Amino acid sequence: TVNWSVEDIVKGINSNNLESQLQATQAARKLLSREKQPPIDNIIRAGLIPKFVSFLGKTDCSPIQFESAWALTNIASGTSEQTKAVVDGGAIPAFISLLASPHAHISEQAVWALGNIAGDGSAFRDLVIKHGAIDPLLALLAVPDLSTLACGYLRNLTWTLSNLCRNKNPAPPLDAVEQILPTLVRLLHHNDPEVLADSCWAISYLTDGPNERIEMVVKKGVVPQLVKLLGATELPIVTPALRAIGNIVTGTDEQTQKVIDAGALAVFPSLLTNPKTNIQKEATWTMSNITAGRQDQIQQVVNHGLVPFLVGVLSKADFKTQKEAAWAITNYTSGGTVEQIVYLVHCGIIEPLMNLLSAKDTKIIQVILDAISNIFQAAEKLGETEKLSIMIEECGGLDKIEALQRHENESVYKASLNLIEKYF
């Protein structure tokens, strides 16, 4: 069955001979499983999808069920048009029926195929749900101890469930999410790094939404386990755990407090210095949403020693991370007490804040100018606007603020004329 032409495949599949059909279907599976440019479109154009779908129902011939499930999985793994071809052939209910197969390799292949279909987007995700995929998928995981399942099998099930949680506009149906969540909570406590990664991905999808969606997850009590995973040595686990945590702190002050209460801030010295740029960026974004909170939450950032780390990232990091750090500072100075703001200055925030005013990015300039105005307002309550002015002049900051008067964007030049006119 190695390297058949599509023509030969079609000839075998159209024979009236189940064993010839099986050999031809296996040949198609092998063509479709090759590394360079599997001929998906040629297979579709040859009209083979409906035949493959009909073979999924051949309970009397489990091998042709497996070969066809694998072939269709690989077509469904392609472009949206290729996945559509599979759905249009009636594959969804046929795959759901195979979830009950007594052959674990066939059940697993149906799980995989449904994952690709759901992974296409919200419409197919929702269509898979409407055809009734969730109940039988979850039934495969209803065992006293997940460790008794084959590892590859459990990984595929977790990945497919994660795709049922994925995508927005719209988000998945609330009742589907409520149905899946208890199983996800259990997977988040499993000891396999790929299951943990995909479970965290699932949770990151579910929390990427308005406070009602975040609340559904938070009330299941998973925040402490997410915080534990945030400290994993495996980057593929840290990345989604951090995205999930970052999503949660975009919600209410009370939701944000659960993240703090669970000990998340103790991990941030490491995250804010992580050698992976994207982790530092996401960690700083998360910090910016925490400093946007209440004064008692800003105080926790202070107590955990995180202000020096924010000064660090502002001083030296990838520019996108520096931009998140600027936001973290503007939010802090906007919501913080006078004493908290004084502390920020004492940690050395001014010089690196001023250095960033050379940035070729009008948004970060607006943000920094806002922060400076906030700091001056605190300085006023203390009658110390003069010490701050000298600090800004000393590190070359005044040179930068005056230049910004000649800035194209209207918001920059106004904000900075104000600073010059009032404090310099």
């Binding site: 690989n74 793994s77 991905w201």
Partner: peptide, 16 residues
């Protein structure tokens, strides 16, 4: 109010 919303898991996988 001052909150700002926002290496991936693949959406589709081919069995090789």
């Amino acid at each position: 109010e001052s909150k700002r919303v926002n290496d991936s898991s693949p959406a589709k996988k081919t069995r090789r």
